[PDB]
Ligand binder design. Structure first.
Ligand code: PE2
Ligand code: PE2
Lengths: 308, 306
């Protein structure tokens, strides 16, 4: 059947993921861009400006953890909306994997992946204290089942160079919170190891008490963020409820094909560099033969209406 | 593999599910209300929070915005146990075994992910304390409907419900008769929605009427004619229209059965055992599935049931 190769470009904001993918796309391929219009208009109203202000009000000590928590938690629900719906309608047409030989019938490039809204950003906001780990796990329990051929390209960029970049300018409503850059960096690192650890066979349940290449110490995976007095019983173990969610986080990430593109270069180098990774990425067949078109018109509709 | 029979006793609160469900149990396990999770574990006394906020809104002390915001977060917390459960359970579910009995194990659940991912949220929306966009965020998050999904919804006339809803109701509640009118309307609609979807109805093909099956104005789609969802030219944006596509594939495959709650206990408890006859069973995926599945229902029970 016609194969389809999907690739999600994720990682912290401000590294140059949007450009590169354009350059990549500018060259069969459709682009599912960031739904700003949803965040700005359709879904709420300046969702991203809302996020940055609340956390700010929180840092000023004008809003209490709970007011920012309740405001943050709900601001996240809006962010992941477009990712979640796209997956939901996409899922059916996705069939069994085929194999990284050139080429596919279609290539869908994504700007971020469900996990970025249902995990990374929240966990990050949690370390930032504007969110709880209970809520964080709530999203984790909603992360959709991982689809075959789910290729995730996270991104590497030096700090000074990343800070430097954010410094110049980025999203409308965005405030330069270096600490946030730090958290969000941390979370995307962990995420990488987490996949690795998991793929190498880690089993957090065994390594709990301990709280490509070699297997990372569970203490270096995302789990570690979940060793908190909120999530622990009077006898120290995690409440089964959360443990069980860490068990889904594990299942979700366990089948992902994660890659690290380097962003410490020219937009073109990033394009060329990201292109040389797309070749070792696993693709899949479609479910209906006429899925390529609908999957196509689907991405073009998302773009035309949510892009900005 | 052995078969399993899962039943999700749903419907509006204040009718007697809880009351009638325990009775059957006292082969059959019972996964209760995660009350300890709503009160303690996930956050603090969530319910009193849901009700207060609605109150403050009603009593003009707070704004629809402020309500919506807190109202949204809370739901996240109310549905948590359902999701994780559904997600930890999922793989043990094999395909529909004919109807093939007697099942090696019967699981009775106290509500389905939809109560927290669709129903109540639809209800609070209808209350001014929650955005339709928000409601569709959870509708999309609705997990794929597993095979052998049987939902029991309850019938009890408004008056009797008012009476039972007032018998006593949860730590923190406040009798909100409107929230009773909102909630009854929702499940009622959902009842029609499942039949709509099974008699072959297409919401895209019917969507313009709002301006053998039930009329689309008598389904959960009619709620999403929320102007906020509509384009300047009245149209419905593709995001929501997709959310609705989801909502449809989700419900259509459900098996919903009606339990008349207007009849004293055991009388309802009886009817609950009678319905069990047409509910679909499933095989489990692995040898040790049933046992793992038993523990889940017992460990959720001791930890979250209060
Ligand atoms: N989901 C979510 N996304 C967040 C958060 N902060 C920044 N972003 C990404 C927003 C821009 C970068 O800041 C990129 O569009 C947050 O709390 N949640
Ligand atoms: N998910 C959700 N549930 C709500 C809300 N309001 C009342 N309930 C009722 C729950 C009842 C179960 O019978 C009382 O325990 C709400 O806003 N969201």
């Amino acid at each position: 059947m016609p194969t389809l190769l999907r690739v999600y470009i994720d990682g912290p904001h401000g590294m140059g993921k949007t450009t590169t993918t354009q350059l990549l796309v500018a060259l069969d391929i459709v682009y599912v861009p960031e739904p700003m219009t949803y965040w700005r208009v359709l879904g709420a109203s300046e969702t991203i400006a809302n996020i940055y202000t609340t956390q700010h009000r929180l840092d000023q000590g004008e809003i209490s953890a709970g007011d920012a928590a309740v405001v943050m938690t709900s601001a996240q629900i809006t962010m992941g909306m477009p990712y979640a719906v796209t997956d939901a309608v996409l899922a059916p047409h996705i069939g069994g994997e085929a194999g990284s030989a050139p080429p596919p019938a279609l290539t869908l490039i994504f700007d971020r992946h469900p996990i970025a809204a249902l995990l990374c950003y929240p966990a990050a906001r949690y370390l930032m204290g504007s969110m709880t780990p209970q809520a964080v796990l709530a999203f984790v329990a909603l992360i959709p089942p991982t689809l075959p051929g789910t290729n995730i390209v996270l991104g590497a960029l030096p700090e000074d160079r990343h800070i430097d970049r954010l410094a110049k300018r980025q999203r409308p409503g965005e405030r330069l919170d270096l600490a946030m850059l730090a958290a969000i960096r941390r979370v995307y690192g962990l995420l990488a190891n987490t996949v690795r650890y998991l793929q190498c066979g880690g089993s957090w349940r065994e390594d709990w008490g301990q709280l490509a290449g070699p297997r990372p110490h569970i203490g270096d995976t995302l789990f570690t963020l979940f060793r908190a007095p909120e999530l622990l019983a009077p006898n120290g173990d995690l409440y089964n409820v959360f443990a069980w969610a860490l068990d889904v986080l594990a299942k979700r990430l366990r089948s992902m094909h994660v890659f690290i593109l380097d962003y410490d270069q020219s937009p073109a180098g990033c394009r060329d560099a990201l292109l040389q990774l797309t070749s070792g990425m696993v693709q899949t067949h479609v479910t209906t033969p006429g899925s390529i078109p609908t999957i196509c018109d689907l991405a073009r509709t998302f773009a035309r209406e949510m892009g900005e």
